[model samples]
Target chain A: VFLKFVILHAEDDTDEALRVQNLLQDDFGIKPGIIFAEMPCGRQHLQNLDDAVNGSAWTILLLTENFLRDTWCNFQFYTSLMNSVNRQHKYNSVIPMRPLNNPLPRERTPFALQTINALEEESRGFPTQVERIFQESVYKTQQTIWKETRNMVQR
Target chain B: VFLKFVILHAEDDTDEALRVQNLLQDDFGIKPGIIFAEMPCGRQHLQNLDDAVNGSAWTILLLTENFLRDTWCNFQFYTSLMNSVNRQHKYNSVIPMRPLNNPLPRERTPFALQTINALEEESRGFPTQVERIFQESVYKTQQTIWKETRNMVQR
Candidate 1:
């Protein structure tokens, strides 16, 4: 049986990792499927990333400096976007959490990924910023669920 | 000189009042033009509600059992909606902040007001929930600014 989850992608950024984790648990009461490379769990966790992304209701990409520049981070980020697109899921499946003050050069970033910037300074505090991400996640999930339920009823 | 602001309507709920105020000020860095029934500033402050609603980038209605039942609250709520619709502002100009766990009956609520429910439990936390409200406010404002700027350049 497949279970829906929220997939989070962050690389070597302990600060944002803790922030996202606290916001997810404290605010939304939901646990995210986090991928940690250094964990003793080994390759099994990496394998779980694929299933996590596939079964997720939403995928969050924590876009720090490392996330934007790292090769492996880019792979995961692009892969998530590709999966979402290939599966014909909703438009905002892979949402990016932009790092504050450190702007990514437009040329280096993918055009499609740039539109949904969760790190917009206009969004009040860290809690508020993460909440906006959660809102979009839930909103898209609800819409998807509604559509599916409606389709089933029609059928 | 006309300045755009965010309009807020709440009735006798100090807890929500402070919460909304902090979210607007701290998160968005925008202050809400809040209407308090017993303001020490007197009639002038009360009269400014009209200007607040009209000049606002967005209007937030803090909906609770008291808000729905109170006549003055209804006036402010409906007035904001009227000002938005009459001025040809965006459909989401006046967003409602429903109190959590306290659901309003469908028949009692106006059709337009019912569409925007910011208090839904599915939305992470209080800060996150308010952030969603802030997001819509800023999103609509940006769209408005964009439309006006485009029109000016075209002319």
Candidate 2:
């Protein structure tokens, strides 16, 4: 069967990333697997992430101050934004999880976005916010794709 | 009076950040006096961001695949976690924002987190998702801080 929900999540926090992945697989039951393209450490691995995001049905952004700094992550963001634009879908499944307390750079402010506060049970303590974001993201992404594909002929 | 509600937002997308900021100021009627900070761009900037996060009250992680790559973002996240060890007060304030459809790194997955989906009206392209995020972040941060402070005062 063709992949139904292909999730591409961008995150740096190790524990936060794992927690979110588990939630998506366990809580949401989002199939077709969730792919994670970790941020590049050195300057070299940047180009290799293309395979991770190439044909993803959805892209979820986990924004943190650190994410903004990583060149690789930035490149991925740029590439993904370009892809979305080429597709001409304004909200073409590029969901951003806005960090509640951290500040962002002055440059990345155009995409009309939504913020998710992780729930208490998701992360260990302060990071539980990640869980809240996970739940909401799965629900909404699935909802959107499902709705859009509802009328289309089954694959 | 000291700031009642502080929202630490982690965002990579510049335009979305601005939209959220506008919402906080316009829709919420909140003079939150927010402090905005982004991750550093180069190696030098990474060092600077480290110094900035030293006494941060609440750590807001703007996570994205790009955020994970920047060693600085990872450092901040790791350091923040370390700082959170003894300080129960600050731990309650750590919030993670999935600004985009990016997953958390494997090392960070223990958080078992999820992303926040677009609201129904937002899917239909009615209101701005960024605006919604701003409102939600403000509300959540206010609530978290309030609850924590109340608990502290009670103790």
Candidate 3:
């Protein structure tokens, strides 16, 4: 069974996404599928993403030139763009992420996402950032918090 | 003699502003006081702008990393930003200009000004752009200039 309500990571690159999934799993002992990556070779991509965004507590966008350049711009984007701009609180549910060492150029992000802060993903330190975000009381089920706490301690 | 009411360009850098006034003069044969840059040693930049914005047809801002970094964030930037975003008809009252050679990187500009379209400074093309701005039902008075409103005002 899949964790239907999982953290959704959206991007065009499958390999890079899997790498993130691996990092999250190792650092937090999140279930293998908790950082959901797009399934390979499926026409259900958009439908899955729609569900993923709706179901997830937090959505992560991989901000890279290829992703920002509209090498791929589809419903995955318009949905994110809407959430990207409309959120009002200090903590944003939709997060943007870039590699710490190779961050995307400041000018490259779409202005809509510029309204939201982008996180730098360093291999060992990102889980700490994630913990701070989870503390925001932004969105989550109590069970899920306890569930993740178990995962954290077990890790 | 004062132009009383004319086009207003607001910024902290009087030196760069003088450059703007000179270009407008040579290109449009725009007489002095037509584009009011701040005085060299006056603390009234803010007070004068309260008058300027009330009187003029248009306002201008120089959009740059230097300007947007909150490096010199002040009423000028905030005032222009409010109009910059709030204008309803396609043409705006606050016109932002960038160098023909230096397009300000999109990310450096604050998320505040992203809503307004910025103009490119072109020796030939900008006058046509300005003419269209003059056509806006926005606001304007007349020929208080070219009347020597000559010692109108300067840095």
Each model's total of backbone clashes: 2, 83, 0
- Native contacts recovered by model 3: 0.00
**Candidate 1 lDDT by residue in tens digits, A1-155:** 12223535454565565666565666667654453432335457657666565556556566665565667666666777777667655345665656453535556666665444444333444454345445655555645664574567679
Candidates' C-alpha lDDT: 0.54, 0.46, 0.51
| Candidate 3 residue lDDT tens string, B1-155 | 23322443335444555666667656655554444554334544444554554344455665543554442243344554444344332125566776543446776665645766677665566768676655424322233332333246441
Best by DockQ: 3
Error of 3 at B119 (Å): 22
* Residue-level lDDT tens digits of model 2 in A1-155: 22223333344454455555565566766455444544345544445344334334556565654665776665566566555545533235465543333434335432222112222232265344434544545545645664454446444
Best prediction by TM-score:
3
Top-down lDDT ranking: 1, 3, 2
> What does candidate 1's lDDT look like per residue over B17-47, in tens digits?
5666665576667643443431211123435
Tens digits of per-residue lDDT for model 3 on A7-44? 44334565566676666666666553544454445657
Give every prediction's interface RMSD. Answer: 17.5, 11.9, 8.8
**Per-residue lDDT of candidate 2, residues B3-99 (tens digit):** 3223333445444445544554566565443434443446443343333333244444545546665433443455455444434545544555444
C-alpha RMSD between model 2 and the true structure: 18.0
DockQ of candidate 3 compared with the true complex:
0.04
Pitting candidate 2 against candidate 3, the one with the higher lDDT is: 3
For model 3 the TM-score comes to: 0.41
- Ranking of models by TM-score: 3, 1, 2
